[PDB]
Coordinates of C-alpha atoms in Angstrom, one line a residue:
Chain A
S1 CA 17.0 5.2 -49.6
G2 CA 17.5 4.0 -53.2
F3 CA 16.7 5.6 -56.5
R4 CA 14.7 4.1 -59.3
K5 CA 13.0 5.2 -62.5
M6 CA 9.5 5.3 -60.9
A7 CA 6.3 5.7 -62.7
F8 CA 3.0 7.0 -61.3
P9 CA 0.4 4.4 -60.2
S10 CA -1.4 3.6 -63.4
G11 CA -4.9 2.6 -62.2
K12 CA -6.6 5.8 -63.1
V13 CA -5.4 5.5 -66.6
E14 CA -6.0 1.8 -67.0
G15 CA -9.7 2.5 -66.5
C16 CA -9.7 4.7 -69.6
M17 CA -8.0 2.4 -72.2
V18 CA -10.1 1.0 -74.9
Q19 CA -9.6 -0.8 -78.2
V20 CA -10.4 1.0 -81.5
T21 CA -10.7 -0.9 -84.8
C22 CA -11.3 0.6 -88.2
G23 CA -11.0 -1.7 -91.2
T24 CA -8.2 -4.1 -90.5
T25 CA -6.3 -1.8 -88.1
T26 CA -6.6 -2.1 -84.3
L27 CA -5.0 0.2 -81.9
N28 CA -5.7 1.9 -78.5
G29 CA -8.0 4.7 -77.5
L30 CA -8.4 6.9 -74.5
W31 CA -12.0 7.0 -73.1
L32 CA -12.8 10.2 -71.1
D33 CA -16.4 11.1 -70.4
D34 CA -18.3 10.3 -73.7
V35 CA -15.3 10.7 -76.0
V36 CA -12.6 8.2 -77.2
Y37 CA -9.4 9.8 -78.5
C38 CA -7.1 7.8 -80.8
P39 CA -4.5 8.4 -83.6
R40 CA -6.2 9.5 -86.8
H41 CA -3.9 7.2 -88.8
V42 CA -6.3 4.4 -87.7
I43 CA -8.4 5.3 -90.7
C44 CA -5.6 4.8 -93.2
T45 CA -4.8 1.8 -95.3
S46 CA -1.1 1.0 -96.0
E47 CA -1.5 2.6 -99.5
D48 CA -3.2 5.7 -97.8
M49 CA -0.1 6.4 -95.7
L50 CA 1.9 7.9 -98.7
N51 CA 0.3 11.4 -99.2
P52 CA -2.9 10.8 -97.2
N53 CA -5.6 13.5 -97.4
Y54 CA -7.1 12.8 -93.9
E55 CA -10.1 15.2 -94.6
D56 CA -11.0 13.1 -97.6
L57 CA -10.3 9.8 -95.9
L58 CA -12.5 10.8 -92.9
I59 CA -15.5 12.0 -95.0
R60 CA -15.6 8.5 -96.5
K61 CA -16.1 7.0 -93.1
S62 CA -19.2 6.7 -90.9
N63 CA -19.8 6.0 -87.2
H64 CA -20.4 2.3 -87.9
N65 CA -16.8 1.9 -89.4
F66 CA -15.4 2.4 -85.9
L67 CA -15.5 -0.6 -83.5
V68 CA -14.8 0.5 -79.9
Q69 CA -14.5 -2.0 -77.1
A70 CA -14.0 -1.3 -73.4
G71 CA -13.0 -4.7 -72.0
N72 CA -15.7 -6.9 -73.4
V73 CA -18.3 -4.1 -73.7
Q74 CA -18.9 -2.7 -77.2
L75 CA -19.3 1.1 -77.1
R76 CA -21.6 2.6 -79.7
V77 CA -19.9 5.4 -81.7
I78 CA -22.5 8.2 -82.3
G79 CA -20.2 10.9 -83.7
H80 CA -16.7 11.3 -85.1
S81 CA -14.5 14.3 -85.8
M82 CA -10.8 15.1 -86.4
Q83 CA -8.7 17.4 -84.2
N84 CA -5.3 17.9 -85.7
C85 CA -3.7 14.4 -85.7
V86 CA -6.2 12.8 -83.3
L87 CA -9.7 11.4 -83.9
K88 CA -12.5 12.1 -81.4
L89 CA -15.1 9.3 -81.4
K90 CA -18.3 10.3 -79.5
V91 CA -19.8 7.3 -77.8
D92 CA -23.2 6.7 -76.2
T93 CA -21.7 6.0 -72.8
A94 CA -19.7 8.3 -70.5
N95 CA -16.8 6.4 -68.9
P96 CA -17.8 5.9 -65.3
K97 CA -14.1 5.6 -64.4
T98 CA -13.1 9.0 -65.8
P99 CA -10.6 10.6 -63.4
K100 CA -10.2 14.3 -62.9
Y101 CA -7.9 15.1 -65.8
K102 CA -6.2 17.8 -67.9
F103 CA -4.6 17.9 -71.3
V104 CA -1.2 19.4 -70.8
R105 CA 1.6 19.8 -73.3
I106 CA 5.1 19.2 -71.9
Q107 CA 8.5 20.7 -72.6
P108 CA 11.6 18.9 -73.7
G109 CA 13.5 17.7 -70.6
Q110 CA 10.3 16.9 -68.6
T111 CA 9.4 13.3 -67.6
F112 CA 6.1 11.3 -67.7
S113 CA 4.8 7.8 -67.2
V114 CA 3.7 5.7 -70.2
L115 CA 1.1 3.0 -70.0
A116 CA 2.0 0.7 -72.8
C117 CA -1.1 -1.0 -74.2
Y118 CA -2.1 -3.5 -76.8
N119 CA -5.6 -4.2 -78.1
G120 CA -7.0 -1.9 -75.4
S121 CA -5.2 -4.0 -72.7
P122 CA -2.6 -2.3 -70.5
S123 CA 0.7 -4.3 -70.6
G124 CA 3.2 -2.2 -68.5
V125 CA 4.2 1.2 -67.1
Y126 CA 7.5 3.0 -67.3
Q127 CA 9.0 6.5 -67.1
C128 CA 10.1 8.5 -70.2
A129 CA 11.6 11.9 -70.8
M130 CA 10.7 14.2 -73.7
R131 CA 14.1 14.5 -75.3
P132 CA 15.4 17.9 -76.5
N133 CA 14.8 16.7 -80.1
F134 CA 11.1 16.0 -79.3
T135 CA 11.4 12.2 -79.5
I136 CA 11.0 9.7 -76.6
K137 CA 13.0 6.5 -76.0
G138 CA 10.1 4.3 -75.2
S139 CA 9.4 0.6 -75.4
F140 CA 6.6 0.1 -77.9
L141 CA 5.8 -2.8 -80.3
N142 CA 3.3 -3.1 -83.1
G143 CA -0.2 -2.3 -81.7
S144 CA 1.0 0.2 -79.1
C145 CA -0.4 3.2 -81.0
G146 CA -2.8 5.2 -78.9
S147 CA -0.9 4.4 -75.7
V148 CA -0.6 7.6 -73.6
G149 CA 1.9 9.4 -71.4
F150 CA 0.8 11.2 -68.2
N151 CA 1.7 12.7 -64.8
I152 CA -0.5 12.6 -61.7
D153 CA -0.8 15.3 -59.1
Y154 CA -3.3 15.1 -56.2
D155 CA -5.6 12.6 -58.1
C156 CA -5.7 14.7 -61.3
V157 CA -4.2 13.0 -64.4
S158 CA -2.4 15.4 -66.7
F159 CA -2.2 13.6 -70.1
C160 CA 0.7 14.9 -72.1
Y161 CA 1.4 12.3 -74.8
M162 CA -0.3 9.9 -77.3
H163 CA 1.8 7.4 -79.2
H164 CA 1.7 7.6 -83.0
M165 CA 4.9 6.0 -84.5
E166 CA 8.4 4.6 -84.4
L167 CA 11.2 6.4 -86.2
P168 CA 14.1 4.6 -88.0
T169 CA 16.5 4.8 -84.9
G170 CA 14.0 3.0 -82.7
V171 CA 12.8 6.2 -80.9
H172 CA 9.2 7.2 -80.7
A173 CA 7.1 10.2 -81.8
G174 CA 3.6 11.3 -80.9
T175 CA 1.3 14.1 -80.1
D176 CA -0.2 16.0 -77.2
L177 CA -3.9 15.1 -76.5
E178 CA -5.1 18.0 -78.7
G179 CA -3.4 16.1 -81.6
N180 CA -0.4 18.3 -82.1
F181 CA 2.8 16.5 -82.7
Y182 CA 5.8 17.0 -80.5
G183 CA 8.7 17.9 -82.9
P184 CA 8.9 18.0 -86.7
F185 CA 7.1 14.7 -87.3
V186 CA 4.0 13.8 -89.4
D187 CA 1.5 10.9 -89.5
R188 CA 2.4 10.0 -93.1
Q189 CA 5.1 7.9 -94.7
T190 CA 8.3 9.9 -95.2
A191 CA 12.1 9.5 -94.5
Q192 CA 11.6 11.6 -91.3
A193 CA 14.3 11.0 -88.7
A194 CA 15.1 12.1 -85.2
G195 CA 17.2 15.3 -85.3
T196 CA 20.4 15.8 -83.3
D197 CA 19.9 15.4 -79.5
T198 CA 21.5 17.0 -76.5
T199 CA 21.9 16.0 -72.8
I200 CA 19.5 17.6 -70.3
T201 CA 22.0 19.4 -68.0
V202 CA 19.6 20.5 -65.3
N203 CA 18.4 16.8 -64.9
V204 CA 22.0 15.5 -64.7
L205 CA 22.6 18.0 -61.8
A206 CA 19.3 16.9 -60.1
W207 CA 20.5 13.3 -60.3
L208 CA 23.8 14.1 -58.8
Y209 CA 21.9 15.7 -55.9
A210 CA 19.9 12.5 -55.6
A211 CA 23.2 10.6 -55.5
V212 CA 24.5 12.8 -52.7
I213 CA 21.3 12.4 -50.8
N214 CA 21.7 8.6 -51.1
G215 CA 25.3 8.6 -49.9
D216 CA 27.4 8.8 -53.1
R217 CA 29.9 11.6 -52.7
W218 CA 33.1 10.5 -54.5
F219 CA 32.6 13.0 -57.3
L220 CA 32.3 16.1 -55.0
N221 CA 35.1 18.6 -54.8
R222 CA 35.9 21.9 -52.9
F223 CA 36.1 23.8 -56.2
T224 CA 33.4 25.9 -57.7
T225 CA 32.9 27.4 -61.2
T226 CA 31.1 30.3 -62.8
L227 CA 27.8 29.7 -64.9
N228 CA 29.6 31.1 -67.9
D229 CA 32.7 28.8 -67.5
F230 CA 30.4 25.8 -66.9
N231 CA 28.4 26.7 -70.1
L232 CA 31.5 26.6 -72.2
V233 CA 32.2 23.1 -71.0
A234 CA 28.5 22.1 -71.5
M235 CA 28.6 23.3 -75.1
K236 CA 31.7 21.2 -75.8
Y237 CA 30.1 18.0 -74.5
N238 CA 26.7 18.5 -76.3
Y239 CA 25.0 19.4 -73.0
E240 CA 22.1 21.9 -72.9
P241 CA 23.1 25.3 -71.6
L242 CA 22.3 25.9 -67.9
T243 CA 20.4 29.1 -67.1
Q244 CA 19.8 31.0 -63.9
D245 CA 16.2 29.6 -63.7
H246 CA 17.8 26.1 -63.7
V247 CA 20.0 27.2 -60.8
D248 CA 17.0 28.7 -59.0
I249 CA 15.0 25.4 -59.6
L250 CA 17.8 23.4 -58.0
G251 CA 17.8 25.6 -54.9
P252 CA 15.8 23.3 -52.6
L253 CA 18.2 20.3 -53.5
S254 CA 21.2 22.6 -53.0
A255 CA 19.9 23.7 -49.6
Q256 CA 19.1 20.2 -48.5
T257 CA 22.6 18.9 -49.3
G258 CA 24.5 22.1 -48.5
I259 CA 26.2 21.9 -51.9
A260 CA 25.9 25.1 -54.0
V261 CA 24.7 24.6 -57.5
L262 CA 27.9 26.0 -59.0
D263 CA 29.9 23.6 -56.8
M264 CA 27.9 20.7 -58.2
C265 CA 28.5 22.2 -61.7
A266 CA 32.3 21.9 -61.0
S267 CA 31.8 18.2 -60.2
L268 CA 29.9 17.7 -63.4
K269 CA 32.7 19.5 -65.4
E270 CA 35.2 17.1 -63.8
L271 CA 33.0 14.0 -64.7
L272 CA 32.7 15.2 -68.3
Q273 CA 36.4 15.8 -68.6
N274 CA 37.7 12.8 -66.8
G275 CA 35.0 10.2 -66.7
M276 CA 34.2 8.1 -63.6
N277 CA 37.5 6.1 -63.5
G278 CA 35.6 2.8 -63.0
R279 CA 33.2 4.2 -60.3
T280 CA 29.4 4.4 -60.4
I281 CA 26.7 6.9 -59.3
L282 CA 23.4 5.5 -58.1
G283 CA 24.2 2.1 -59.9
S284 CA 25.1 3.8 -63.2
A285 CA 28.3 4.2 -65.1
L286 CA 26.8 7.0 -67.3
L287 CA 25.5 10.4 -66.3
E288 CA 21.7 10.1 -66.2
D289 CA 19.5 12.9 -67.6
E290 CA 16.0 11.5 -67.4
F291 CA 15.2 12.6 -63.8
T292 CA 14.0 16.2 -63.3
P293 CA 14.5 18.2 -60.1
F294 CA 10.8 17.3 -59.2
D295 CA 11.4 13.6 -59.8
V296 CA 14.4 13.7 -57.3
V297 CA 12.4 15.7 -54.7
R298 CA 9.4 13.3 -55.1
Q299 CA 11.5 10.1 -54.4
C300 CA 14.4 11.4 -52.2
Chain B
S1 CA 11.7 -1.3 -80.2
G2 CA 13.3 0.1 -77.1
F3 CA 13.8 -1.6 -73.7
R4 CA 12.9 -0.2 -70.4
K5 CA 12.5 -1.4 -66.8
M6 CA 8.8 -1.9 -67.1
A7 CA 6.4 -2.6 -64.2
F8 CA 3.0 -4.3 -64.4
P9 CA 0.0 -1.9 -64.4
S10 CA -0.7 -1.3 -60.8
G11 CA -4.4 -0.6 -60.7
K12 CA -5.4 -4.0 -59.3
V13 CA -3.0 -3.5 -56.4
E14 CA -3.8 0.2 -55.8
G15 CA -7.4 -0.8 -54.9
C16 CA -6.0 -3.0 -52.1
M17 CA -3.8 -0.5 -50.3
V18 CA -5.0 0.8 -46.9
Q19 CA -3.5 2.6 -43.9
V20 CA -2.9 0.8 -40.6
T21 CA -2.2 2.7 -37.4
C22 CA -1.4 1.2 -34.0
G23 CA -0.2 3.6 -31.3
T24 CA 1.9 6.3 -32.9
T25 CA 3.0 4.1 -35.9
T26 CA 1.3 4.4 -39.3
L27 CA 2.2 2.1 -42.2
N28 CA 0.6 0.4 -45.1
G29 CA -1.7 -2.7 -45.3
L30 CA -3.0 -5.0 -48.0
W31 CA -6.7 -5.5 -48.0
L32 CA -7.9 -8.7 -49.7
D33 CA -11.5 -10.0 -49.1
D34 CA -12.1 -9.3 -45.3
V35 CA -8.4 -9.4 -44.2
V36 CA -5.8 -6.7 -44.0
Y37 CA -2.1 -7.9 -44.0
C38 CA 0.6 -5.7 -42.6
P39 CA 4.1 -6.0 -40.9
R40 CA 3.7 -7.1 -37.4
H41 CA 6.3 -4.6 -36.2
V42 CA 3.5 -2.0 -36.4
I43 CA 2.7 -3.1 -32.8
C44 CA 6.1 -2.3 -31.5
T45 CA 7.3 0.9 -29.8
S46 CA 10.9 2.0 -30.4
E47 CA 12.0 0.4 -27.1
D48 CA 10.0 -2.8 -28.0
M49 CA 12.3 -3.3 -31.1
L50 CA 15.3 -4.6 -29.1
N51 CA 14.4 -8.2 -28.1
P52 CA 10.6 -7.9 -28.8
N53 CA 8.5 -10.9 -27.8
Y54 CA 5.7 -10.4 -30.4
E55 CA 3.5 -13.0 -28.8
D56 CA 3.4 -11.0 -25.6
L57 CA 3.1 -7.7 -27.4
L58 CA 0.1 -8.9 -29.4
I59 CA -1.8 -10.4 -26.4
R60 CA -1.7 -6.9 -24.9
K61 CA -3.4 -5.5 -27.9
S62 CA -7.1 -5.6 -28.8
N63 CA -9.1 -5.0 -32.1
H64 CA -9.7 -1.3 -31.1
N65 CA -5.9 -0.6 -31.0
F66 CA -5.8 -1.0 -34.8
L67 CA -7.1 1.9 -36.9
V68 CA -7.6 0.8 -40.6
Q69 CA -8.6 3.3 -43.3
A70 CA -9.3 2.6 -46.9
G71 CA -9.2 6.1 -48.5
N72 CA -11.4 8.1 -46.2
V73 CA -13.5 5.0 -45.1
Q74 CA -12.6 3.6 -41.6
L75 CA -12.7 -0.2 -41.6
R76 CA -13.8 -1.9 -38.4
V77 CA -11.2 -4.5 -37.1
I78 CA -13.1 -7.5 -35.7
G79 CA -10.2 -9.9 -35.3
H80 CA -6.5 -10.0 -35.2
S81 CA -3.8 -12.7 -35.4
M82 CA -0.2 -13.2 -36.1
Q83 CA 1.2 -15.2 -39.0
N84 CA 5.0 -15.4 -38.9
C85 CA 6.1 -11.8 -39.4
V86 CA 2.8 -10.5 -40.7
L87 CA -0.4 -9.4 -38.8
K88 CA -3.8 -10.4 -40.2
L89 CA -6.5 -7.9 -39.2
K90 CA -10.0 -9.2 -39.9
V91 CA -12.3 -6.4 -40.9
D92 CA -16.1 -6.1 -41.1
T93 CA -16.0 -5.4 -44.9
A94 CA -14.7 -7.5 -47.7
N95 CA -12.8 -5.4 -50.2
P96 CA -15.0 -5.0 -53.3
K97 CA -12.0 -4.4 -55.4
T98 CA -10.2 -7.7 -54.5
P99 CA -8.6 -9.1 -57.6
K100 CA -8.0 -12.7 -58.3
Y101 CA -4.8 -13.3 -56.4
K102 CA -2.2 -15.7 -55.1
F103 CA 0.5 -15.6 -52.5
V104 CA 3.7 -16.8 -54.2
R105 CA 7.2 -16.9 -52.9
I106 CA 9.8 -16.0 -55.5
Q107 CA 13.4 -17.1 -56.1
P108 CA 16.5 -15.0 -56.1
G109 CA 17.0 -13.7 -59.6
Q110 CA 13.3 -13.2 -60.3
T111 CA 11.8 -9.8 -60.8
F112 CA 8.6 -8.1 -59.6
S113 CA 6.8 -4.8 -59.5
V114 CA 6.7 -2.7 -56.4
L115 CA 3.9 -0.3 -55.6
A116 CA 5.5 2.2 -53.1
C117 CA 2.9 3.5 -50.7
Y118 CA 2.8 6.1 -47.9
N119 CA -0.1 6.4 -45.5
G120 CA -2.2 3.9 -47.5
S121 CA -1.7 6.1 -50.6
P122 CA 0.2 4.7 -53.7
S123 CA 3.1 7.0 -54.7
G124 CA 4.9 5.1 -57.6
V125 CA 5.6 1.8 -59.3
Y126 CA 8.9 0.3 -60.3
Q127 CA 10.6 -3.0 -61.1
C128 CA 12.9 -4.8 -58.6
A129 CA 14.8 -8.1 -58.7
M130 CA 15.3 -10.4 -55.7
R131 CA 19.0 -10.4 -55.4
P132 CA 21.0 -13.6 -54.8
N133 CA 21.6 -12.4 -51.1
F134 CA 17.7 -12.0 -50.6
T135 CA 17.8 -8.2 -50.5
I136 CA 16.1 -5.9 -53.0
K137 CA 17.5 -2.5 -54.2
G138 CA 14.2 -0.6 -53.9
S139 CA 13.3 3.0 -53.4
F140 CA 11.6 3.3 -50.0
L141 CA 11.4 6.1 -47.5
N142 CA 10.0 6.3 -43.9
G143 CA 6.4 5.1 -44.0
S144 CA 6.8 2.6 -46.9
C145 CA 6.5 -0.4 -44.7
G146 CA 3.7 -2.7 -45.8
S147 CA 4.3 -1.8 -49.5
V148 CA 4.0 -4.9 -51.7
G149 CA 5.8 -6.5 -54.6
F150 CA 3.8 -8.5 -57.2
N151 CA 3.5 -9.9 -60.7
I152 CA 0.4 -10.1 -62.8
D153 CA -0.5 -12.9 -65.2
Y154 CA -3.9 -13.0 -67.0
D155 CA -5.6 -10.6 -64.4
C156 CA -4.3 -12.7 -61.4
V157 CA -2.0 -10.8 -59.0
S158 CA 0.7 -13.0 -57.6
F159 CA 1.9 -11.1 -54.5
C160 CA 5.5 -12.1 -53.6
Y161 CA 6.8 -9.4 -51.3
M162 CA 5.9 -7.2 -48.3
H163 CA 8.3 -4.4 -47.2
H164 CA 9.6 -4.5 -43.6
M165 CA 12.9 -2.6 -43.3
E166 CA 15.9 -0.9 -44.7
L167 CA 19.4 -2.4 -44.0
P168 CA 22.6 -0.3 -43.4
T169 CA 23.7 -0.3 -47.1
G170 CA 20.4 1.2 -48.2
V171 CA 19.0 -2.1 -49.5
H172 CA 15.7 -3.5 -48.5
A173 CA 14.4 -6.6 -46.7
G174 CA 11.0 -8.1 -46.4
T175 CA 8.8 -11.2 -46.4
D176 CA 6.5 -13.2 -48.5
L177 CA 2.7 -12.7 -47.9
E178 CA 2.7 -15.6 -45.5
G179 CA 5.1 -13.5 -43.3
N180 CA 8.3 -15.5 -43.9
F181 CA 11.4 -13.3 -44.5
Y182 CA 13.4 -13.5 -47.6
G183 CA 17.0 -14.1 -46.4
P184 CA 18.5 -14.2 -43.0
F185 CA 16.8 -11.0 -41.7
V186 CA 14.6 -10.4 -38.6
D187 CA 12.0 -7.8 -37.6
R188 CA 14.0 -6.7 -34.5
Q189 CA 16.9 -4.3 -34.0
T190 CA 20.3 -6.0 -34.7
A191 CA 23.5 -5.2 -36.7
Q192 CA 22.1 -7.5 -39.5
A193 CA 23.6 -6.6 -42.8
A194 CA 23.2 -7.7 -46.4
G195 CA 25.5 -10.6 -47.1
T196 CA 27.8 -10.9 -50.2
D197 CA 26.0 -10.7 -53.5
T198 CA 26.6 -12.1 -57.0
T199 CA 25.5 -11.1 -60.5
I200 CA 22.6 -13.0 -62.0
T201 CA 24.3 -14.6 -65.1
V202 CA 21.2 -15.9 -66.8
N203 CA 19.5 -12.5 -66.6
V204 CA 22.6 -10.8 -68.2
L205 CA 22.5 -13.3 -71.1
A206 CA 18.7 -12.5 -71.5
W207 CA 19.5 -8.8 -71.6
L208 CA 22.2 -9.4 -74.3
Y209 CA 19.5 -11.2 -76.3
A210 CA 17.2 -8.2 -75.8
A211 CA 20.0 -5.9 -77.1
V212 CA 20.5 -8.1 -80.2
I213 CA 16.7 -8.0 -80.8
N214 CA 16.9 -4.2 -80.6
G215 CA 19.8 -3.9 -83.0
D216 CA 22.9 -3.8 -80.7
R217 CA 25.4 -6.4 -82.1
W218 CA 28.9 -5.0 -81.6
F219 CA 29.7 -7.4 -78.7
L220 CA 28.9 -10.5 -80.9
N221 CA 31.7 -12.8 -82.1
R222 CA 32.0 -16.0 -84.2
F223 CA 33.6 -17.8 -81.2
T224 CA 31.8 -20.2 -78.9
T225 CA 32.7 -21.6 -75.5
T226 CA 31.9 -24.6 -73.3
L227 CA 29.5 -24.4 -70.3
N228 CA 32.4 -25.6 -68.1
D229 CA 34.9 -23.0 -69.5
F230 CA 32.2 -20.2 -69.2
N231 CA 31.6 -21.2 -65.6
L232 CA 35.3 -20.8 -64.7
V233 CA 35.1 -17.2 -66.0
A234 CA 31.7 -16.6 -64.2
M235 CA 33.2 -17.7 -60.9
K236 CA 36.2 -15.4 -61.3
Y237 CA 34.0 -12.3 -61.9
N238 CA 31.5 -13.1 -59.0
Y239 CA 28.8 -14.2 -61.5
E240 CA 26.3 -16.9 -60.6
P241 CA 27.1 -20.3 -62.2
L242 CA 25.1 -21.1 -65.4
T243 CA 23.3 -24.4 -65.6
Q244 CA 21.8 -26.4 -68.4
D245 CA 18.3 -25.4 -67.2
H246 CA 19.4 -21.8 -67.7
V247 CA 20.6 -22.7 -71.3
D248 CA 17.2 -24.5 -71.9
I249 CA 15.3 -21.4 -70.6
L250 CA 17.2 -19.2 -73.0
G251 CA 16.2 -21.5 -75.9
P252 CA 13.4 -19.3 -77.3
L253 CA 15.6 -16.2 -77.3
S254 CA 18.5 -18.2 -78.9
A255 CA 16.2 -19.4 -81.6
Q256 CA 14.6 -16.0 -82.3
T257 CA 18.0 -14.3 -82.8
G258 CA 19.8 -17.4 -84.2
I259 CA 22.6 -17.0 -81.7
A260 CA 23.4 -20.1 -79.7
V261 CA 23.5 -19.7 -75.9
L262 CA 27.1 -20.8 -75.7
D263 CA 28.0 -18.3 -78.5
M264 CA 26.4 -15.5 -76.4
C265 CA 28.3 -16.9 -73.4
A266 CA 31.6 -16.3 -75.4
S267 CA 30.4 -12.6 -75.9
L268 CA 29.8 -12.3 -72.1
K269 CA 33.2 -13.7 -71.4
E270 CA 34.8 -11.1 -73.6
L271 CA 32.8 -8.3 -72.0
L272 CA 33.9 -9.4 -68.5
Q273 CA 37.5 -9.6 -69.6
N274 CA 37.8 -6.5 -71.7
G275 CA 34.9 -4.2 -70.8
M276 CA 32.9 -2.3 -73.3
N277 CA 35.7 0.0 -74.5
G278 CA 33.5 3.1 -74.3
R279 CA 30.5 1.5 -76.0
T280 CA 27.0 0.9 -74.6
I281 CA 24.4 -1.9 -74.6
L282 CA 20.7 -0.8 -74.6
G283 CA 21.8 2.6 -73.2
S284 CA 23.9 1.1 -70.4
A285 CA 27.6 1.1 -69.8
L286 CA 27.2 -1.8 -67.3
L287 CA 26.0 -5.4 -67.7
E288 CA 22.4 -5.4 -66.5
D289 CA 21.2 -8.4 -64.5
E290 CA 17.6 -7.3 -63.4
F291 CA 15.7 -8.6 -66.5
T292 CA 14.8 -12.2 -66.6
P293 CA 14.3 -14.2 -69.8
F294 CA 10.5 -13.8 -69.3
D295 CA 10.9 -10.0 -68.9
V296 CA 12.8 -9.9 -72.3
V297 CA 10.2 -12.1 -74.1
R298 CA 7.4 -10.0 -72.6
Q299 CA 8.7 -6.6 -74.0
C300 CA 10.8 -7.7 -77.1

C-alpha cells in the first residue's frame, strides 16, 4: 500500500558522476568506459554565450584545458570532440564502475529519475516527467549542469537526459545523451521560453487506477463514456487527447481493478467538470499526471 | 529553481541490502561489517504471530536455519541473537561495501529516505516523514520488510528506520536499528491501529519559505501575528503547536527571504481560514508538511 513518487536506486549512476572544469566553469560529467560526456557550453565564457560558434570555440581548446576529477582522482583527458550539444572527453582510464547502459531518447509523457549533482558530487534523486512541451520541472541550482536522467531495467541503465539550462519560468531544458535537445531550445543566450503545455491524460488515468488499487473509490461512477465524447472534454480542459493505444496500454490496470478504461474516463470527466469537492486522491487535491501506466504497475 | 521531494543518493545503502530466508519467509536484511540486521518476525510462522514468544522461537532455531544471500553470494551465518525487535545474524564475511554509518533514532516531524527492497534487491527510493503518530506513509508491498530509512551527511549514513509491518489504514510501522519500535506498535497480530495524527506546523512554514524562494508570493500579507494567537489557530486546525525553538530554527529562511517568522505565520493562518481559492503553492493545492527546514535549505 501507499503511492509515492519513487526514483530508481541511483548507485549505478553515482559511480559515473565526475567533475569537469574548463576555464572558470565547473559542472558535472558522465563517465562511461573511457569517455566523459558533459554539456558543450562548459567551454563558453559569459560573453561567448551570445552567438557562440562552438566549432571555433572548441578548435581553440586542447586536452589540457579540461580538468576531469572522479572523486579525488584526476583523469587525464587524451582526446576531445563535439557531438551535437555534448562534449566527449576521452580519458586515459575506463571507469571500472561502468554499468550496462544504453542511450535512449524518451517521449513526452514518460518519466525518469534525476540524480542532481554539484561539483561531480551526487546530492539527491527524484522522479521527473518529460512534459508535452519538452521541458522538465526539476530541482536544479547553479552547478547542476551535466546532471543526468535515467531509467533502470534489469541492471541496465537507460540514460535519457542531460541537464543544460533553466528557462525563465523555472523549468528545465536539456538533451539526450547524443547531445540533441528535447524541444525547441538552444545552448545560447536568447529569450527562449517554455511553450504552452498540456496535461498527460493517460498518466492521470493510470494514477486513478493506482488510487483505486490503494482503496480510494469515491470518484468512481456507474456511467461510461465514448472515446470521442471523452476527447471533446479533454480538449476543453487542455488535456492531451486519448488514443486507442492509450486504452490498450491501460488494459492490465483495467483488468486488475475490473474498471473499464472508458468507465474511468467518465470519472475523469466528472472530476474535470466538478472538481473534488474538498476530497483528495492518494493525498492530492489535484489530478496528478507524472505517473505512467508502467510507474503504477511497478509500485502497485 | 524547482522543489521536489528529493531522496539521498542510495548507492551506499544499496551495497548493504541482502536477502534473509528462514523457513518459508523471505525478507530483506542490512549487512554492515559482519552483521546482518533484519526483523525478528522472520522466524515466525503465520500461527506463531498470535502471542509469539520470540525467546522460545529463537532458541529453537540454529545458524543453519537462516539463509543469507548478498546478490548471488551465500553468506555463512555463524551466530544469531535478538536485540529488541531485530535479529542480528553474524556472518563469516564483513561487507566490503560497508559505509561509515550510525544508528540514529529520529523524532516525529523529521524526514528520511527509504530504499524499498524486495528479495534483497533495491526497487526504488523516496522521501518519508515520521508522522506525529509515529507511522510513516510509505510505499511498501509484500516482501518489503527489512527495507531501511536513512539520511546521509558527508558520506556517513545515519540509519533511522527498519520496516516491519503495514497497519490497517495502509500506513507503515517499524523500528530504529536497535530494534525499538517507533510508536505504540508490536511485531505480533493485534487490532493495533494508527492513532490520531496532526500536521507538522514548522515543516509547513518551511515549505512556504521554499515557495517564496521559488517565486510564489500570492499568500504573503503585510500582517503579523503573535505566537500565542497563531497557536490558538493551529490547535483549531489540528496543527502541532509552534514553539520559540521552531521560530529560531526558521531564522535562516526568514533572513534569506526577509519575511519574519510571525509574518509567515499570519499567512498560514489566512490559508487555514480561507483556503487557497483555486491557487497553488509549489504545484500543490494542499499545505505540505513533509519538508523540514533542513530539507528546504538543502534544495533551495
